[PDB]
């Protein structure tokens, strides 16, 4: 096609099947390098169940976004505010809970566009900081967030099957 620009969309319940599919695909791709598929499966079978993501799609303090590259789905983003945050960071905070780019679109600026939009949304929502959890072994993501001015401010355990994983908490104030 002739569409070089990326386009953003807010997901609705008719995107559920597509959301489930990309959520699983990108999660496995991210964690399979250093986690067993058996452990990834147990995380997926609870977090990305269709009924589970349906309720999250109905949470008005959360929002899912799809990003398209020449009319093909290239990644997705989930943000939380208020009581939808996975940690109680308070009324002035804005969580990026999920931010993923499909493999075939990596290294083409899709992730930077998603995060740039996430920060725009936080500003419009009058929030004072953006925060997120990043696996301590996902050094590429760490460097990605660091170029946006995120800084490690703590940690948080992340259970994947029977294996305890450790997320960094990274924060960008503004």
Residues 43 and 160 sit within 8 Å (Cβ to Cβ): yes
In total, the chain counts a number of residues equal to: 174
As a whole number of Å, the end-to-end CA separation of the chain is 37
Number of domains into which the chain is organized: 1
Exp. method: X-ray
Starting at the earlier edge strand, list the strands of the sheet with 163-173.
Answer: 6-10, 62-69, 72-81, 93-101, 129-135, 163-173, 151-160
User: Tokens representing 28?
Assistant: 């496995």
Residues 97 and 131 sit within 8 Å (Cβ to Cβ): no
Q: What's phi and psi for 130, nearest 5 deg?
A: -110, 135
The three-class DSSP label of residue 32 is coil
Residues 66 and 113 sit within 8 Å (Cβ to Cβ): no
DSSP state of 5: S
Just list the catalytic residues.
145
Return the bridge partners of 165, or none.
158
Return the bridge partners of 170, or none.
132, 152
Return the bridge partners of 63, or none.
79
Annotate 120-137 with b (16+ C-beta within 10 A) or e (fewer): ebbeeeebebbbbbbbee
Residues 67 and 8 sit within 8 Å (Cβ to Cβ): yes
Domain range spanning residue 148?
1-174
User: Tokens representing 2?
Assistant: 């002739």
Other Cβ atoms less than 10 A from the Cβ of 165: the count is 18
Other Cβ atoms less than 10 A from the Cβ of 13: the count is 11
């Amino acid at each position: 096609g002739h569409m070089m620009e990326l386009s953003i969309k807010r997901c609705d319940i008719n995107d559920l099947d597509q959301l489930v599919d990309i959520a699983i695909e990108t999660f496995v791709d991210t964690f399979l390098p250093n986690n067993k598929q058996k452990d990834i499966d147990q995380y997926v079978i609870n977090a990305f169940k269709s009924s589970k993501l349906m309720d999250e799609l109905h949470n008005p303090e959360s929002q899912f976004f799809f990003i398209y590259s020449d009319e093909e789905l290239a990644g997705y983003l989930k943000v939380n505010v208020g009581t939808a945050q996975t940690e109680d960071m308070g009324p002035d905070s804005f969580e990026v809970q999920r931010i993923y780019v499909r493999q075939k679109f990596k290294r083409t600026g899709v992730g930077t566009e998603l995060m740039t939009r996430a920060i725009q949304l936080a500003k419009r929502a009058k929030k004072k900081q953006v925060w997120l959890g990043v696996w301590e072994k996902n050094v590429n993501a760490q460097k990605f967030y660091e170029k946006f001015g995120f800084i490690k401010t703590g940690s948080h355990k992340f259970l994947m099957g029977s294996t305890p994983n450790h997320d960094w908490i990274m924060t960008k104030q503004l």
